[model samples]
Target chain A: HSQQSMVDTFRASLFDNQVADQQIQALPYSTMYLRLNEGQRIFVVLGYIEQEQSKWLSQDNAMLVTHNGRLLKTVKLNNNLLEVTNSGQDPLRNALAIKDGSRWTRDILWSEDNHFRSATLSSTFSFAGLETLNIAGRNVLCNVWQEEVTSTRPEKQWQNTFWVDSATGQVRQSRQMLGAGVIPVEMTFLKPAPL
Target chain B: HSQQSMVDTFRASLFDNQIQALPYSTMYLRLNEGQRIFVVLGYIEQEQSKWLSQDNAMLVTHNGRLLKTVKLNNNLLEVTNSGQDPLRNALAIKDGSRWTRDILWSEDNHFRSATLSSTFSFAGLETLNIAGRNVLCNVWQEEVTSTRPEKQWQNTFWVDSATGQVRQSRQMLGAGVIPVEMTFLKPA
Candidate 1:
């Protein structure tokens, strides 16, 4: 249910150009890549400015890692801070040592402000016994979560929905509701990385 | 302030995807053109097995020209009966005519059930002014009104915030503390 809901939300938000007060001047553009590690998961998201002067050339990246819902780290490259948390707990405030010799420092370009506050949150998960759909002819399972917050909210509120591809334990779709209009922010699955 | 609030509502819903839900399962397969003389308004919706299938096409047309808000009509093409007011107020029901004359009808092998609807006792208007940018844009103005024996409301929507594109929007039927609600559910 969560996954299905998330998928629906994401699709709607991405395609419905006229909802929130702000009209989207551009179209939806995203890129995803995943890497499977021993007992760990790593994923990256690239949100693009669809109509930049550079067109497809302008993009920002966000990285996430999790081990059984115990989030290892999340780094919003543009914001320039690494959030290291243990097992879904409140992330250590600025836990990421900027000068450390981690790959993130070399790969991610931090934001000028040095911190990224969440704008919203939304998520969904799978219930037992739901049939998984075939994506690109591959069997997969999926769970999706989304969160958004405005500069005014002290703490971001979130909703999560997930859809699991039973055969592959990959997420097919997820949607998160945010803001006064309760818009559904969506996430979709692409090709998975080599195990 | 009203414009800001309205814009905020649209912005929030736009970013969130609630707009998609408003017209869930409804796709713009193609347009069918036919000539008619009466003015009609209300919520319009349709259901189809696929984006191209048109066998079960239906239209729920409502006319707002009448005086008594309670007087409404429903026409079912499949059933070929008019003047069925299943929902007492036309404002409360969805209305619109079918597109049976479009050239694409034969390619699809059948007529798709298409529906449109609107209320009678609603009306409103809004003005547009741009303060920050100089851009080439198209502007238009529109007014929408509806009426009911027990209530009335109106809304004037700016189709484009950057440029002035006025269009009629849904209205809150009653007044008082309780918030007004409008919902479009996806057909199961």
Candidate 2:
């Protein structure tokens, strides 16, 4: 069977023999568009939902876009307009746009002292891993690295892991680990609309 | 308007404005099933090139579910059947049949892992003030403590400060620091 047929079969299986007396929605879907390099693009789709609604409403749509390992944009269509865009040095401006346009906003505050302290932390750029997995049929890999600071308190630490598709180098997923008991935050594959 | 109508209006706003032409799926959605607890789910849907004849040729479904300010049951879905119930330790499993015979035998590997650590890159947590906004600035965050022989250390490392969540973390011990990571690579 073709990949599409396989997907349909899987979809049918998800609902087959499943009790549906409660309210249910179609298996929600999402599309992610990722730009690995100047010319390469990676597209992905996945299923997602709020943890609380897992019992009642099973599926929800979600999308994300990234360049290399850096997050470029994210859009959530279910609740309200949730978007995040990165513009390099102008992250503040881009962030502001998202906060203002959306009904909900998360304020990210920074002080001059904090900025100075953070700048003292050295940042090293390198691919973290070699082998990730196939996301939406694309072979992927993980890139891991650390940011080292050489100041008075030179502390070297592991950064984050980047899950990128090997064929396209586009990041299909991204996550950061904080500590034990806390779940690693994540961003998954989503299909993107054309420009 | 009803919830369905509100959702339709939301879709129309995007489609009518030409923001999308080809059928585009959503990236994520937030739902409030009840009070105090809100859930956020992300999804990815892709089209299969060889299956053009089918009405719905999109292949694969990657889903991620998150609860606000709380840890989620990462083990809700697993690829390899361990013969144990996912909600075995949680209070919710008491009301339902915890064990369901695995159906997608062909895709056993896809449901093994409990988290979505496979698809996205994670960054270390950092504190940033974007203008006047107080952003937690992290992809993910967790509490870690290290113990090695004679030395012990504990610290809170924020992951992905930009995204306000922790993705990867570590605990420092007598010798050095050990790394820990998370991913949502598997199917739900």
For every candidate, give the share of true A-B contacts it also has: 0.00, 0.00
Candidate 2 at A1: error in angstroms? 50
Candidate 2 similarity to native, TM-score:
0.23
**Candidate 1 deviant stretches above 4 angstroms:** A1-76, A88-131, A137-156, A167-195, B1-188
What's the C-alpha lDDT at position A75 in model 1? 45
Candidate 2's C-alpha lDDT?
Answer: 0.27
Deviation from native of the Cα of residue A100 in model 2, angstroms: 36
**Against the true two-chain complex, what DockQ does each candidate achieve?**
0.01, 0.01
Q: What is the TM-score of each candidate against the true structure?
A: 0.21, 0.23
Model 2: which docking level applies?
Answer: incorrect
In model 2, how large is the Cα lDDT of residue A27?
19
Candidate models: Cα lDDT each:
0.26, 0.27
